[PDB]
Design a protein around this motif. Structure first.
Motif, PDB file in Angstrom:
ATOM      1  N   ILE A 155      49.386 -10.339  14.986  1.00  0.00           N
ATOM      2  CA  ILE A 155      50.779  -9.887  14.856  1.00  0.00           C
ATOM      3  C   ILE A 155      50.935  -8.977  13.646  1.00  0.00           C
ATOM      4  O   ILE A 155      51.526  -7.893  13.732  1.00  0.00           O
ATOM      5  CB  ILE A 155      51.778 -11.059  14.786  1.00  0.00           C
ATOM      6  CG1 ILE A 155      51.834 -11.755  16.151  1.00  0.00           C
ATOM      7  CG2 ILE A 155      53.148 -10.542  14.369  1.00  0.00           C
ATOM      8  CD1 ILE A 155      52.537 -13.100  16.188  1.00  0.00           C
ATOM      9  N   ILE A 161      52.491  -4.975  13.997  1.00  0.00           N
ATOM     10  CA  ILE A 161      53.699  -4.532  13.336  1.00  0.00           C
ATOM     11  C   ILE A 161      53.393  -3.463  12.295  1.00  0.00           C
ATOM     12  O   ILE A 161      54.051  -2.439  12.276  1.00  0.00           O
ATOM     13  CB  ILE A 161      54.464  -5.669  12.653  1.00  0.00           C
ATOM     14  CG1 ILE A 161      54.798  -6.777  13.652  1.00  0.00           C
ATOM     15  CG2 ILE A 161      55.749  -5.117  12.029  1.00  0.00           C
ATOM     16  CD1 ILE A 161      55.496  -7.968  13.040  1.00  0.00           C
ATOM     17  N   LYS A 197      54.483   0.515  12.237  1.00  0.00           N
ATOM     18  CA  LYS A 197      55.403   0.974  11.198  1.00  0.00           C
ATOM     19  C   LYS A 197      54.693   1.781  10.126  1.00  0.00           C
ATOM     20  O   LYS A 197      55.220   1.946   9.022  1.00  0.00           O
ATOM     21  CB  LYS A 197      56.091  -0.226  10.539  1.00  0.00           C
ATOM     22  CG  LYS A 197      56.872  -1.131  11.484  1.00  0.00           C
ATOM     23  CD  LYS A 197      58.043  -0.446  12.153  1.00  0.00           C
ATOM     24  CE  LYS A 197      59.118  -0.052  11.159  1.00  0.00           C
ATOM     25  NZ  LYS A 197      60.072   0.895  11.788  1.00  0.00           N
ATOM     26  N   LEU A 199      58.410   0.334   4.300  1.00  0.00           N
ATOM     27  CA  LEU A 199      58.933  -1.020   4.495  1.00  0.00           C
ATOM     28  C   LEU A 199      59.360  -1.621   3.174  1.00  0.00           C
ATOM     29  O   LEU A 199      58.700  -1.432   2.150  1.00  0.00           O
ATOM     30  CB  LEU A 199      57.862  -1.899   5.135  1.00  0.00           C
ATOM     31  CG  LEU A 199      57.428  -1.481   6.536  1.00  0.00           C
ATOM     32  CD1 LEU A 199      56.340  -2.404   7.039  1.00  0.00           C
ATOM     33  CD2 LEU A 199      58.607  -1.484   7.486  1.00  0.00           C
ATOM     34  N   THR A 200      60.468  -2.353   3.193  1.00  0.00           N
ATOM     35  CA  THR A 200      60.946  -3.027   1.998  1.00  0.00           C
ATOM     36  C   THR A 200      60.144  -4.293   1.777  1.00  0.00           C
ATOM     37  O   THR A 200      59.470  -4.784   2.708  1.00  0.00           O
ATOM     38  CB  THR A 200      62.425  -3.425   2.132  1.00  0.00           C
ATOM     39  OG1 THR A 200      62.569  -4.339   3.222  1.00  0.00           O
ATOM     40  CG2 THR A 200      63.318  -2.195   2.362  1.00  0.00           C
ATOM     41  N   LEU A 248      61.338  -7.268   1.598  1.00  0.00           N
ATOM     42  CA  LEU A 248      61.896  -8.252   2.541  1.00  0.00           C
ATOM     43  C   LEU A 248      61.208  -8.217   3.908  1.00  0.00           C
ATOM     44  O   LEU A 248      60.826  -9.242   4.450  1.00  0.00           O
ATOM     45  CB  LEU A 248      63.387  -7.975   2.746  1.00  0.00           C
ATOM     46  CG  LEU A 248      64.106  -8.836   3.793  1.00  0.00           C
ATOM     47  CD1 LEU A 248      63.964 -10.322   3.463  1.00  0.00           C
ATOM     48  CD2 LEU A 248      65.571  -8.434   3.870  1.00  0.00           C
ATOM     49  N   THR A 249      61.061  -7.022   4.456  1.00  0.00           N
ATOM     50  CA  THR A 249      60.364  -6.819   5.733  1.00  0.00           C
ATOM     51  C   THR A 249      58.861  -7.192   5.628  1.00  0.00           C
ATOM     52  O   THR A 249      58.334  -7.857   6.514  1.00  0.00           O
ATOM     53  CB  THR A 249      60.565  -5.385   6.228  1.00  0.00           C
ATOM     54  OG1 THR A 249      61.981  -5.114   6.333  1.00  0.00           O
ATOM     55  CG2 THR A 249      59.875  -5.182   7.593  1.00  0.00           C
ATOM     56  N   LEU A 275      58.663 -10.873   5.737  1.00  0.00           N
ATOM     57  CA  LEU A 275      58.871 -11.407   7.088  1.00  0.00           C
ATOM     58  C   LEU A 275      57.689 -11.141   8.016  1.00  0.00           C
ATOM     59  O   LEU A 275      57.384 -11.970   8.858  1.00  0.00           O
ATOM     60  CB  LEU A 275      60.159 -10.878   7.694  1.00  0.00           C
ATOM     61  CG  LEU A 275      61.413 -11.556   7.146  1.00  0.00           C
ATOM     62  CD1 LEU A 275      62.659 -10.691   7.360  1.00  0.00           C
ATOM     63  CD2 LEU A 275      61.611 -12.927   7.764  1.00  0.00           C
ATOM     64  N   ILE A 276      57.013 -10.006   7.859  1.00  0.00           N
ATOM     65  CA  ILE A 276      55.812  -9.733   8.651  1.00  0.00           C
ATOM     66  C   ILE A 276      54.770 -10.823   8.381  1.00  0.00           C
ATOM     67  O   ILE A 276      54.183 -11.373   9.299  1.00  0.00           O
ATOM     68  CB  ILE A 276      55.201  -8.360   8.339  1.00  0.00           C
ATOM     69  CG1 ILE A 276      56.092  -7.257   8.906  1.00  0.00           C
ATOM     70  CG2 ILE A 276      53.794  -8.253   8.941  1.00  0.00           C
ATOM     71  CD1 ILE A 276      55.754  -5.860   8.428  1.00  0.00           C
ATOM     72  N   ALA A 309      55.227 -13.915   7.061  1.00  0.00           N
ATOM     73  CA  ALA A 309      55.634 -15.231   7.504  1.00  0.00           C
ATOM     74  C   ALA A 309      55.467 -15.336   9.017  1.00  0.00           C
ATOM     75  O   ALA A 309      55.032 -16.372   9.523  1.00  0.00           O
ATOM     76  CB  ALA A 309      57.067 -15.551   7.077  1.00  0.00           C
ATOM     77  N   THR A 310      55.776 -14.250   9.721  1.00  0.00           N
ATOM     78  CA  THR A 310      55.629 -14.207  11.175  1.00  0.00           C
ATOM     79  C   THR A 310      54.180 -14.388  11.589  1.00  0.00           C
ATOM     80  O   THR A 310      53.867 -15.217  12.444  1.00  0.00           O
ATOM     81  CB  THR A 310      56.134 -12.877  11.770  1.00  0.00           C
ATOM     82  OG1 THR A 310      57.484 -12.655  11.364  1.00  0.00           O
ATOM     83  CG2 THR A 310      56.098 -12.924  13.290  1.00  0.00           C
ATOM     84  N   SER A 327      53.124 -17.889  10.856  1.00  0.00           N
ATOM     85  CA  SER A 327      53.647 -18.903  11.789  1.00  0.00           C
ATOM     86  C   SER A 327      52.732 -19.023  13.000  1.00  0.00           C
ATOM     87  O   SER A 327      52.521 -20.117  13.498  1.00  0.00           O
ATOM     88  CB  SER A 327      55.070 -18.611  12.256  1.00  0.00           C
ATOM     89  OG  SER A 327      55.131 -17.478  13.108  1.00  0.00           O
ATOM     90  N   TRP A 339      64.938 -18.353  -0.895  1.00  0.00           N
ATOM     91  CA  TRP A 339      64.917 -17.885   0.494  1.00  0.00           C
ATOM     92  C   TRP A 339      63.493 -17.948   1.048  1.00  0.00           C
ATOM     93  O   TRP A 339      63.288 -18.424   2.162  1.00  0.00           O
ATOM     94  CB  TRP A 339      65.487 -16.471   0.600  1.00  0.00           C
ATOM     95  CG  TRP A 339      65.505 -15.908   2.012  1.00  0.00           C
ATOM     96  CD1 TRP A 339      66.498 -16.060   2.953  1.00  0.00           C
ATOM     97  CD2 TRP A 339      64.504 -15.092   2.614  1.00  0.00           C
ATOM     98  NE1 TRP A 339      66.167 -15.386   4.102  1.00  0.00           N
ATOM     99  CE2 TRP A 339      64.946 -14.786   3.927  1.00  0.00           C
ATOM    100  CE3 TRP A 339      63.271 -14.583   2.179  1.00  0.00           C
ATOM    101  CZ2 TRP A 339      64.204 -13.996   4.797  1.00  0.00           C
ATOM    102  CZ3 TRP A 339      62.523 -13.802   3.056  1.00  0.00           C
ATOM    103  CH2 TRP A 339      62.998 -13.520   4.351  1.00  0.00           C
ATOM    104  N   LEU A 365      62.013 -20.003   4.212  1.00  0.00           N
ATOM    105  CA  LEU A 365      61.284 -19.266   5.235  1.00  0.00           C
ATOM    106  C   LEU A 365      60.009 -19.981   5.678  1.00  0.00           C
ATOM    107  O   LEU A 365      59.700 -20.051   6.883  1.00  0.00           O
ATOM    108  CB  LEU A 365      60.954 -17.868   4.712  1.00  0.00           C
ATOM    109  CG  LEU A 365      60.102 -16.938   5.561  1.00  0.00           C
ATOM    110  CD1 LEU A 365      60.776 -16.590   6.889  1.00  0.00           C
ATOM    111  CD2 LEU A 365      59.801 -15.684   4.763  1.00  0.00           C
TER     112      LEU A 365
END
Lengths: 205, 209
Positions: free
Chosen positions: B43, B47, B51, B56-57, B59-60, B63-64, B66-67, B70, B109, B113
């Motif tokens: 994944i 992504i 991109k 990318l920030t 934050l993004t 999230l990449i 953590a995704t 997961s 946060w 997450l």
């Protein structure tokens, strides 16, 4: 100013159309920006080759995409005085994820980087009516609209009835706490849009 | 029962050798699986490739990762734990806490997450000053990598100064996590053999229950 207007509702509710029509009308007299990515579809395909995509990971894939659109387009537009219309916002995630068993409180925390809309229109309509209307459009039901991952056996039409019914339940639950403006999507597109234009028209002065 | 053992530390701290050395010992008696936080999976690649032309920030990026994690967690780590494996992680979620919070992502946060992931049965923090870790890298005669220098945050520094500043910030995050996360703080200034013997004593007593 910077005004965030979100539309929510089930697939076939016409919220996309109502969002576009609103932008086209707001353009006449104010700066406005109307808001998924190809890679999400690529992740799903590849995941199918892999025999696994958890609800957790599905939730996080969408949050990642949303964070990028939020930090790249929505927030800067807002900061610089645009009216931003979002066709689907964080409440779509709340419903999509919680119906798959992802704790909604965790989803709220996940998306808590994003501001609440100034206005959220919920275009509420029976799934039976939304299905009938897609049926008159002669358009085929996508797997995502049928909750195919949740209801893999069923016909797309039965899938859609059940899945959009579950989504409706989450939206109905959010109405009071999130201050949704509930719109009767039984009405015609014209009646709905006129009603919305008059409502938002309380930015005219 | 399955057991999760995490190692945390800066680049040059030796925490990767310590993880491998522990795996070489546990492996003689029990089923063990050694993973690294830095070993991102499919994944992550889809992504980021998709991109590659976009900025990318933090934050993004947060999230990449953590995704991707997961999926790794559900596909590999958790079933190995459920099957009674000992899982050793060379860097774990605490590395994301540091990398993300140092780049302005709110650390509370980030903790929420990653709350889908269990905490390690033990976390060894192989603590060493960036100065000593830098000297060790220099003596090895290899270059500091941009990521080791936090070159995205500090592009105007030399690799050496970037390393000292960036690894100094990571150290600060880890130090701030010690009390809440019950890190076992190991003096990474000692020899690899001495450090490992301590780890093996702690791990021995843990497995002995």
């Amino acid at each position: 100013k910077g005004v965030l207007i979100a539309f929510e509702g089930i697939d076939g509710s016409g919220k996309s159309s109502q969002a576009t029509l609103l932008k086209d009308w707001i353009e006449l007299k104010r700066d406005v920006y109307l808001t998924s990515s190809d890679w999400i579809h690529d992740i799903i395909k590849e995941a199918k080759k892999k025999d696994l995509l958890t609800p957790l990971t599905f939730s996080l894939i969408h949050a990642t995409d949303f964070s990028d659109r939020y930090e790249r387009y929505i927030l800067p537009m807002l900061k610089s005085g645009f009216i931003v219309i979002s066709d689907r916002y964080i409440y779509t995630a709340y419903a999509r994820d919680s119906v798959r068993g992802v704790d909604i409180d965790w989803v709220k925390k996940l998306y808590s980087f994003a501001i609440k809309p100034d206005i959220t229109f919920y275009i509420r309509v029976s799934p039976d009516i939304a299905l009938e209307r897609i049926k008159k459009s002669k358009r085929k039901i996508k797997p995502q609209e049928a909750g195919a991952d949740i209801f893999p056996g069923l016909s797309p039409e039965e899938g859609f009835l059940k899945y959009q019914g579950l989504i409706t339940e989450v939206y109905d639950k959010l109405v009071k706490d999130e201050n949704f403006i509930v719109i009767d999507g039984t009405k015609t597109p014209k009646e709905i849009q006129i009603q919305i234009r008059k409502f938002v028209g309380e930015l005219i002065d």
